[PDB]
Structure 1
Amino acid sequence: ESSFVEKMKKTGRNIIVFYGSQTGTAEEFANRLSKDAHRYGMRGMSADPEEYDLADLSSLPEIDKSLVVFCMATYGEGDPTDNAQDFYDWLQETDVDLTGVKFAVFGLGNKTYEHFNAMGKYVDQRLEQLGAQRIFELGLGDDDGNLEEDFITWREQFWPAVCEFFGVEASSIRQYELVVHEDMDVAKVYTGEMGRLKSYENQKPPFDAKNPFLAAVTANRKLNQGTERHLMHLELDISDSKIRYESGDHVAVYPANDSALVNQIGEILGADLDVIMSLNNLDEESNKKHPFPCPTTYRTALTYYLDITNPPRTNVLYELAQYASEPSEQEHLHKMASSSGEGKELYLSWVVEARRHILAILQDYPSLRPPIDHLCELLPRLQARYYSIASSSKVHPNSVHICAVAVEYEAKSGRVNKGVATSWLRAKEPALVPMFVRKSQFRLPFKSTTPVIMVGPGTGIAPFMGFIQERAWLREQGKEVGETLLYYGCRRSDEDYLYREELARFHKDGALTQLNVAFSREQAHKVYVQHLLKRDREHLWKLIHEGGAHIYVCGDARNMAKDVQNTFYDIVAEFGPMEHTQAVDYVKKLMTKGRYSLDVWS
């Protein structure tokens, strides 16, 4: 086709978006993205790259306020897509100078492959190498979690940053319309249920994400023996739900921000929380009609529907800039949308790091008198929290037990913050809880004879309690129980050693073969479950290799899980003697076979 530089100035645009699409996902992203520009300041066009003459790239800065964007999918072992071939090889063997050219890239990928967004990474790197300048972070979409979610996140924060570098700024364009139903009948207003109206009152199965069951809290005891943190065991009765579960399974939970916290926002925002209302999605052919169950109050929303705790995203701060009367105040808000410079430096420091929630922002920015309805547009939905079930359905058919740490801490915000679910959970005294049961493939093996290694430092001991219960049960049934190992860990023996007595009972009952306990602050050198493993290596090896033992790692993911993995690698490497790298292969094979299974979080 006739050159794209010409066709931009001819069709009246500044922004251009190229898509490398195989199955049309990249295209989908590209098209939505250039259509965002149109009502966000500028005006974009999405194009198939194979039909335009790509030498014309350093000819882009001839269009004033120009930016170029790339949406490319990673295929195979990190290789390119169809319509992207001409470009790719040119890029590989060019180095003619791109100084002054503005760009940004989004990668479409999957974490189960070891070439994660290799395509996207390449393109993003290469352009910089030629003299060109990046405006926004390279996106790393992931199909293992949810690629779409990763995209939407990235997109949410792109536009605000783009605006700030260039100036532009309609910086305000709405997506919902407020419709007060000021005089309206009572039982057609949502009170915080998740699915249908009065779903929380009319409880019949199916019970799930959209019709939670409300389980009655049978008890709550502080397992925490010290004072450092509060760690708690709760018992949720699911008697007539006829929900089934298996040990190691999750139970998901629908919490409510502490109403006290709620109220402050309402106050300082200065509206009536109890105002019955709806926000209607005005983009008519969007069947996503309200951001949350409507009709309902602001009270009901802030308490049950919206996420008022996890700090703001960049975009919402940019949105809010407009309600600040103070110029200086406005400026700060405007800055924290920049994807780089000082602007990015600040935001990470004073928002995300300091864990300034919505409320804190308002408190720290007096000018912010934004409308409550518009805020109830800009807030993320309250995500449910899930908990590894700490019971066995064979000993507790009618009860789902949870183990958890309650969250609470001095941030750099000066503000003491609270955990939503955990604080909420804590207040539930022996009071109903909306929850469902989601399946995991964290499971005990079929052969009761199969030995088990359980590694569960901290609350990670949770699902493993269920495991232990099940093993105990087996022995009551006269079935042959294999070797059963718990490698647990905590800070100090008298402080936070979860289920001390019951675990010990299990020890002496024969049900738990070895109770190994890593006490980490009982000396000035730290003692971890890896250490314990190292100590026992030979015993472990015979179990894994002769007994055909299963491996379970539950708990902290950042450090612990992969330290444990490394320890296992070393065990393999020395005992059916291998190259380190051979050992890793063996380990990996184990996982595939389904003999090494995890269940972590942060």
Structure 2
Amino acid sequence: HDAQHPCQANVAVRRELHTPASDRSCTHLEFDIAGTGLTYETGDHVGVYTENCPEVVEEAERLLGYSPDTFFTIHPSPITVRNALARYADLLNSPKKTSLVALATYASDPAEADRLRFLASAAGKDEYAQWVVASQRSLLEVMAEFPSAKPPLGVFFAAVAPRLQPRYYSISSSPSMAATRIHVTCALVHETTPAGRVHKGVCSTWIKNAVPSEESKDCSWAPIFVRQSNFKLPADPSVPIIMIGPGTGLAPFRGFLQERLAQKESGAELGPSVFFFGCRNSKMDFIYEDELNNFLEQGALSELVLAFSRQGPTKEYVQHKMAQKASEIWDMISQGAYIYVCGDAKGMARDVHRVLHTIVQEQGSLDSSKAESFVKNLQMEGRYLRDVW
């Protein structure tokens, strides 16, 4: 197989991970790779191809004016407009400037065409940055703003809408525990753009609503593929590890705990392992709670320190639980520990990154530049891994 060009894989199980008391959602999904050439390793990513929501496809058909019963060859052999808009057109992301140039070329209203060309010009870079990018206006909202821009079928797919990208997920299973299934842990995305558009995450919604073979024969399926990563466990189990990913950052570590549990059903000494997990509330989004405690019953995990974002008077996060445990994690580093970080890259990672910078000082007696350059060397050594998005 080839990673980029997918394998028609089937969804076997699809389950909600949060309690009904929770007001968010996170899905546990398993792809069935039996009878396929797909192989994966612990810590790898699975790329998933999806399709647009039907209402989004409808709005595009309204704006474009094509006959959805038109067959054409997208540079499936021939495909209808509706299915090309569903599976191959990114409709909700913001149009690039070259896409605006193409819209203007077909805008029959002088004022609208002038405004489109302006938005793509250097003189318009400031208005483009605010009205398109900062407001997260979709291509569909731009086209409604300029209803005279009617590009032909070929131009639209070649220059106006880019391809619907696959969404990547850090596999949450180990091949030793399930070489027939690729597990994913996918949080539902549902936000409101600054300009007020209700956006449903394209892939996370398709995963949340997918029909599993465990509940019906007429079950969902997706073209999937595996991407090799460097988010890997050390060579031998004696090496201690530190895992920090909260929320969906738990994903790869579930395979991490499955991999080492499988090996040491027949392997070697456990070696210290500590999992820093965080979530909103033990009654809401403590995903995989039972499975986590089972890993602690056996020798997989050794200590699971928890941070609760909205359970109690003190709002805690994984980095707050790290500074309290700053004494033992330093000991772990001198014992040669690998440190893993997975999950949100904008805040959690930045805060976790700048909290072990500050505890390698107090517990290391280095100043800033010496603590900074030291942490950098842990990365170059390959002992400080980050799988963030």
Match of 2:12 among 208, 211, 218: 218
Equivalent position to 1:534, from 323, 332, 340: 323
Q: What residue in structure 2 maps to residue 562 of structure 1?
A: 350
Could you tell me which residue of structure 1 aligns to residue 250 of structure 2? 461
- Give CA-to-partner distance per residue, 1:293-325, whole Å, 9 cap, x none: 754332332222221121111221232124434
Please name the residue that 1:198 is paired with: none
Q: Which residue of 1 aligns with 2:144?
A: 363
Please state how far the C-alpha of 1:551 moved relative to its aligned partner.
Answer: 0.6
1:372 alignment partner AA: L
Q: Which runs of 5+ in 1 are unaligned?
A: 1-205, 280-289
SS of the equivalent of 1:347 reads: helix
Q: Partner of 1:497 in structure 2?
A: 286
Relative to structure 1, the CA distance from residue 568 to residue 412 in structure 2 (aligned partners, 3 Å threshold; closer, same or farther) is closer
Give the structure 1 partner of residue 228 of structure 2.
Answer: 439
Q: 2:113 aligns with which of 327, 330, 335?
A: 330
Q: More deviation in 467-476 or 445-454?
A: 467-476
Amino acid at match of 1:468: L
Q: Is the 8 A contact 1:474 1:480 kept in 2?
A: no
* CA gap 1:412/1:585 in 2 versus in 1, 3 angstroms: closer
Per the alignment, residue 92 of structure 2 pairs with 309
Q: Which has the higher contact order (CA 8 A, sep 6+)?
A: 2
Local SS of the residue matching 2:51: coil
Contact in 1 for aligned 2:170/2:251 (Cα 8 Å): yes
1:275-286 matches, cutoff 5 A: 275-278=70-73
Aligned equivalent of 2:215:
none
- AA aligned opposite 1:368: A
Counterpart position of 2:46: 251
Instruction: Give 3-state SS (helix, strand or coil) of 1:217's partner.
Output: strand
* 1:349-388 alignment runs, 5 A limit: 349-378=130-159, 379-388=161-170
Name the % identity: 42
Q: State yes or no: 1:573 paired with 2:356.
A: no
AA aligned to 1:508 is E
Cα shift at 1:474:
3.1
Contact preservation (8 Å) 2:68, 2:81: yes
Where 2:222 maps in the other structure, the secondary structure is strand
Alignment of 1:118-129 (within 5 A): none
CA contact (8 A) 1:488 1:516 kept: yes
CA distance in 1: counterparts of 2:103 and 2:204, whole angstroms = 30
Aligned mate of 1:422, from 185, 201, 204 = 204
Equivalent residue number for residue 88 of structure 1? none
Note the C-alpha offset of 1:389: 0.2
Matched, 1:237 2:32: yes
* 2:89–2:163 CA contact under 8 A, matched in 1: yes
CA RMSD of aligned residues (A): 2.1
Cα separation, partners in 2 of 1:374 and 1:524, compared to 1, 3 Å? farther
For the residue of structure 1 that corresponds to 2:120, the secondary structure is coil
Cα distance, 1:416 vs. partner?
A: 1.2
1:394 match: secondary structure: helix
Q: In 2, Cα distance between the equivalents of 1:582 and 1:413?
A: 45
CA distance in 2, matches of 1:412, 1:350: 10
Q: Quote the Cα distance in structure 2 between the aligned partners of 1:435 and 1:323.
A: 36
Equivalent residue of 1:481, what SS?
coil
Residue pair 1:450, 1:549 contacting (<8 A) in 2 also: yes
Residues 180-215 of structure 1 deviation map (CA, whole Å, 9 limit, x = unaligned)? xxxxxxxxxxxxxxxxxxxxxxxxxx24312x1122
Equivalences for 1:49-448 in 2 at 5 Å? 206-210=1-5, 212-225=6-19, 226-278=21-73, 290=75, 295-340=78-123, 343-378=124-159, 379-430=161-212, 431-448=220-237
Q: Are residues 1:587 and 2:375 paired?
A: yes
Deviations 1:354-392, CA, capped at 9 Å, x for gaps: 322222222333323332332122221221111100001
Q: Deviations over 1:60-103 (max 9, x none)?
A: xxxxxxxxxxxxxxxxxxxxxxxxxxxxxxxxxxxxxxxxxxxx
Counterpart of 1:218, as a letter, is: A
C-alpha contact (below 8 Å) 1:207/1:243 kept by paired residues: no
Q: Cα distance 1:558–1:413, how it changes in 2: closer, same or farther (>3 A)?
A: same
Mapped partners of 1:565, 1:415: distance in 2: 33
- The DSSP-based 3-state class of the residue aligned with 2:178 is coil
8 Å contact 2:245–2:342 — kept in the other structure? yes
Which secondary structure state, in structure 1, belongs to the residue aligned with residue 341 of structure 2? Answer: strand
Work out whether residues 407 and 418 of structure 1, in 8 Å CA contact, stay in contact via their aligned partners in 2. yes
Deviations 1:412-465 (A, max 9, x none): 333211212111222221121111111001111121111110010220111011
Query: What TM-score results when the alignment is normalised by the length of structure 2?
Result: 0.91
1 CA distance for matches of 2:142 and 2:330? 54
Residue pair 2:186, 2:207 contacting (<8 A) in 1 also:
no
Q: Give the match's secondary structure for 1:395.
A: helix
Partner of 2:217 in structure 1?
A: none
User: Hey, what's the Cα distance between the residues in 2 that align with 1:584 and 1:249?
Assistant: 29
Residues 22 and 283 in structure 2, CA contact (< 8 A), matched pair in contact too:
no
Write the deviation string for residues 116-162 of structure 1: whole angstroms up to 9, x where unpaired: xxxxxxxxxxxxxxxxxxxxxxxxxxxxxxxxxxxxxxxxxxxxxxx
Question: Is the contact made by 1:269 and 1:370 (CA closer than 8 Å) also made in structure 2?
Answer: yes
Find the aligned partners of 1:592 and 1:270 in 2 and give their Cα distance. Answer: 54
d(CA) in 1 for partners of 2:122 and 2:77? Answer: 35
SS at match of 1:219: strand
The structure-2 alpha-carbon separation of the partners of 1:353 and 1:294, relative to structure 1 and needing over 3 Å to count, comes to farther
Moved over 6 A (4+): none
1:300 aligned partner, one-letter code: N
Corresponding residue for 2:216? Answer: none
Deviation by residue 1:512-541 (Cα, 9 ceiling, x = unmatched) = 211111112335764221111100111111
Partner of 1:53: none
The amino acid of 2:228's aligned partner reads K
Secondary structure of the structure 2 residue equivalent to 1:215: strand
